[PDB]
Homo-oligomer: 251 residues x 2
């Protein structure tokens, strides 16, 4: 029987980048749905503050997603604390923009190492855990509208996000046999505290003109999609890229 | 419309081809020479590049390039411009394949794949595009992707990540550089019967793979090269950001 309230009661979720922005909203949503949440972030202080805020079912873990050791140690620590991992969300991304003829190798490598390699390392470590446990699982990787369309100044970002989608689809293909659904979530511009700042004024008004919905997405809306994809209502959804873009990419 | 020559000549255009001394790069270099182009054969060693450029005759010249090194790539482009005066066409065909089950695949296989297939394509496309923008005469950039840039394939988690990435990257260069007359496209083959590929699919391995391809066979390097000639020509000036599958229909099912 599929419970159409989409409960997550007693499931254990990892959320990378979980202490701010989209990741904070996902952590909060998962807590509200009865899950245990491992809040993973590169800053121990930021993770500590977020997990304390979210209450007794949220615990902090330091994790540099670009580091295989840091990732493996975090996964081990989450298992030691909670017993198992049912859900993992990868929402540690970075954005480094410049015209394509100018963009530095540093901007390129940081983008690829964090957005693409980081998603690889976290997905592989969590998936190994899930395979060993034998109870299936859910992996949700944040991609972007930029995993579907080109955007000016986003050569590295688009490369990383298109890559995340191909990568995630391959994990989905190979891990169906283990009951692990692997999907991507692809937002348009999101009104995180940062995004509010970066898309204020006429710049934001101009961007909204091209979105059929006529506004940007809230982090809470991205988290609602994560809740659905993490649930028992989505067991036949795998390899999917769910766009939350207000129509941006369809024109 | 201009007179568009439906023989698709590349007379006096200068083309760089990475991985130009073997497999698909070698076939592309040979095709471009046959169409009248000057070809800069880039490969990882001086001897290998020299042997191909000698094979291809007086309009082909050799250059050493490790596409995963910014310095190597920049030096190669500078040397090509010194030798030929300009770059009109660049093809990135130096890719690598490292396969393993997704839960097992090493960070070494991941890095080698991303660094050559994706970062290498970025470095070459950026260096070539800079030269093209500066010269003001437009240009053509053709990046080899793969059927694996559209579909997942078991054991190909790093390969698919790199090839999806190449397409996204290439489409962004296309969007930004249309204003400078530079078309940037990808070519996405199924399995190709390079000297290597022949050895690699020699088995029932090959016969089973073919059952899933509507065309019922693999592609030859010369077929990939024919598509490259078309995309490098004046018959393709309105084609940019496109991914042209040469997959015998593999990906449509």
């Amino acid at each position: 029987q599929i419970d159409l309230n989409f409960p997550l009661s007693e499931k254990v979720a990892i959320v990378t980048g979980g202490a701010s922005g989209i990741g904070a909203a996902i952590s909060k949503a998962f807590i509200a749905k009865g899950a245990k949440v491992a809040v993973l972030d590169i800053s121990a202080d930021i993770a500590k503050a977020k997990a304390e805020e979210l209450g007794e079912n949220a615990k902090p873990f330091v994790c540099d997603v670009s580091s295989q050791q840091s990732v493996n140690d975090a996964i081990t620590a989450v298992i030691s604390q909670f017993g198992k991992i049912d859900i993992a969300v990868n929402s540690a991304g970075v954005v480094y923009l410049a015209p394509a003829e100018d963009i530095s190798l540093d901007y390129w490598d940081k983008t690829i190492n964090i957005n693409l390699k980081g998603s690889f390392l976290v997905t592989q470590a969590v998936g190994r855990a899930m395979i060993a446990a034998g109870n299936g699982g859910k992996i949700i990787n944040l991609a972007s509208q930029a995993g579907t369309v080109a955007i000016e100044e986003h050569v590295a970002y688009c490369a990383s996000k298109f890559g995340v989608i191909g990568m995630s689809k391959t994990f989905a293909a190979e891990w169906g046999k283990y009951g692990i659904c692997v999907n991507t979530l692809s937002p348009t511009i999101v009104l995180t505290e940062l995004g509010k700042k970066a898309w204020a004024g006429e710049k934001g008004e101009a961007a909204k003109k091209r979105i059929p919905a006529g506004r940007f997405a809230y982090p809470e809306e991205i988290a609602a999609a994560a809740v659905f994809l993490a649930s028992a209502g989505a067991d036949m959804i795998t390899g999917a890229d769910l766009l939350i873009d207000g129509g941006y990419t369809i024109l």
